[PDB]
Amino acid sequence: QLHKPDVVAAATKILDDHGIADLTMRRLARELDVTPGALYWHFANKQELLGAVADHILRTARLAWREQIHESCRALRDALLSHTDGAELVSASFASGQSVVITEIVEQLGRAARAAGVSDADVDAAARTVIYYVLGFTVDEQSRLQWDGTRQFRFGLQLLVDGLAAH
Amino acid sequence: MQLHKPDVVAAATKILDDHGIADLTMRRLARELDVTPGALYWHFANKQELLGAVADHILRTARWREQIHESCRALRDALLSHTDGAELVSASFASGQSVVITEIVEQLGRAARAAGVSDADVDAAARTVIYYVLGFTVDEQSRLQWDADGTRQFRFGLQLLVDGLAA
């Protein structure tokens, strides 16, 4: 059997050099000089592979409530921007539920929502609301940087902080 | 879920017929079996093994002058009854993955020694025949597809060969 962390590292390197459309199982198998069946032992399909790559790329991504939101979002966006198509990949892993880390990130953001006076039945909805903005914002930005900044990002994020203040 | 080998071969043959050899991919095969791609590798280590199985699937009924003529008549007609039939059989002969195509060369070998071919040139004479058959049929099927005597010429070239075999 292949050693997982090897595979996810080769996968991440394909993403950085060639982008997310080129991250396929056949291409991963060839760079690893391995039988494609050995890869499917670890990952059922591309969505499960993408989930581990996302956990890998967010491994460095995760005080005062208003401050704890601005900071966890800044660190999320900076990690998405350090890899080719990072925000798109992480957006798809969130949707598919295949990344533990993004849910760990969101669960954190909920807490900051409780604090701001957000009711307990609407906490994770508020968390997600923030994460949809960040993904939404950074997919757009990254697409445009790649077909050749944070001021706007902060400003958008300042709207959500206020809206959470009104509970 | 439970995938059996003959079902995959049948599905693969269906894709070949409806869409041609370029569309016969491991992910599309898995999609038409309604299956994750990993299930295919229970039975096939790679695409070239898969193509060899469908080469033998479509050549299943296809297996001294007259014996050459008949063996070749039966081969070309099996080939012509599947989209890209000859290109697929050409690729599985090169890769050694086709079991029944080997048998046909053996059978042509016997006839070749019957015409007086030296023992060391038997296999080359047999393959010389297959090369002409493949070359012709590959050309023919591609011309048949460019549509917005055939058998006459086939047997003519095949006779040039039977004549040359007589020395």
The DSSP output letter for B121 is G
Six token digits for residue A31 = 């760079």
Distance of CA B89 to the CA centre of its chain: 3
Q: E-assigned strands of chain B?
A: none
Tokens 């493949």, residue located: B134
Question: Which amino acid, residue A144?
Answer: R
Asked if A46 contacts A24 with a C-beta cutoff of 8 angstroms, the reply is yes
User: What phi, psi does A93 have (nearest 5°)?
Assistant: -75, -40
Q: Report chain B residues touching chain A, CB-CB < 8 A.
A: 26-27, 36-38, 41, 45-46
CA pair distance B108, B167, nearest whole angstrom: 17
Burial B75-84 (b: 16+ CB within 10 A, else e): bbebbbebbb
Six token digits for residue B114 = 């019957």
Tokens 């077909």, residue located: A147
* Closest of B124, B118, B135, B132 to residue B160, by C-alpha: B132
Question: Which amino acid, residue B28?
Answer: R
Helix A65-81 crosses helix A100-115 at what angle (to 10 degrees)? 160
The secondary structure of chain A in percent helix, strand, coil, rounded to multiples of 5, reads: 75, 0, 25
Q: What residues of chain B lie within 8 A of the CB of A37, using their CB? A: 38, 41, 45
The DSSP output letter for A97 is T
The DSSP output letter for B45 is S
**From residue A36, how far is each of A6, A157, B1, B10, B12 by CA, in Å?**
15, 43, 20, 22, 18
CA pair distance B7, A37, nearest whole angstrom: 19
Tokens 């199985």, residue located: B53
CA pair distance A90, A131, nearest whole angstrom: 11
Which of B31, B33, B36 to probe the A interface (max A CBs under 10 A)? B36
Distance of CA A40 to the CA centre of its chain: 23
Tokens 């017929």, residue located: B17
* Closest of B72, B74, B85, B82 to residue B130, by C-alpha: B72
Three-class DSSP category at B83: coil
B97: how many CB neighbours lie within 10 A of its CB? Answer: 20
End-to-end distance of chain B based on CA atoms, in angstroms?
60
Six token digits for residue A41 = 């032992």
Six token digits for residue B77 = 């007609």
Asked if B63 contacts B73 with a C-beta cutoff of 8 angstroms, the reply is no
CA pair distance A78, A87, nearest whole angstrom: 10
Three-class DSSP category at A117: coil
* Closest of A15, A50, A16, A8 to residue A32, by C-alpha: A8
Which residue among B37, B45, B46 sits closest to A45, beta carbon to beta carbon? B37
CA pair distance B150, B144, nearest whole angstrom: 11
Six token digits for residue A66 = 């208003």
Three-class DSSP category at A2: coil
* Closest of B89, B86, B127 to residue B108, by C-alpha: B127
Three-class DSSP category at A84: coil
Six token digits for residue B57 = 């699937």
Tokens 């439970």, residue located: B2
**From residue B97, how far is each of B5, B76, B91 by CA, in Å?**
16, 19, 9
CA pair distance B87, B79, nearest whole angstrom: 9
Tokens 């959470």, residue located: A164
Six token digits for residue B66 = 């007259």
Cβ–Cβ pairs < 8 A, chains A and B: 22
Question: What is the number of residues in chain B?
Answer: 167
The count of C-alpha atoms lying within 13 angstroms of the C-alpha of A19, restricted to the half-sphere facing its C-beta, is 5
* Closest of A141, A113, A115 to residue A128, by C-alpha: A113
Three-class DSSP category at A13: helix
Experimental approach: X-ray
CA pair distance A41, A43, nearest whole angstrom: 6
Give me the domain span that covers residue B158: 1-167
* Closest of B103, B4, B17 to residue B54, by C-alpha: B17
Question: What is the number of residues in chain A?
Answer: 167
Tokens 């003959």, residue located: B6
Tokens 């401050």, residue located: A67
CA pair distance B67, B81, nearest whole angstrom: 21
CA pair distance A110, B167, nearest whole angstrom: 90
B7: how many CB neighbours lie within 10 A of its CB? Answer: 13
CA pair distance A153, A150, nearest whole angstrom: 5
Our CA angle for B140, B23, B9, nearest 5°, is 90
Asked if A82 contacts A61 with a C-beta cutoff of 8 angstroms, the reply is no
The DSSP output letter for A63 is -
Asked if B68 contacts B109 with a C-beta cutoff of 8 angstroms, the reply is no
Which of B1, B8, B27 to probe the A interface (max A CBs under 10 A)? B27
* Counted domains in chain A: 1
* Closest of B92, B95, B88, B3 to residue B40, by C-alpha: B3
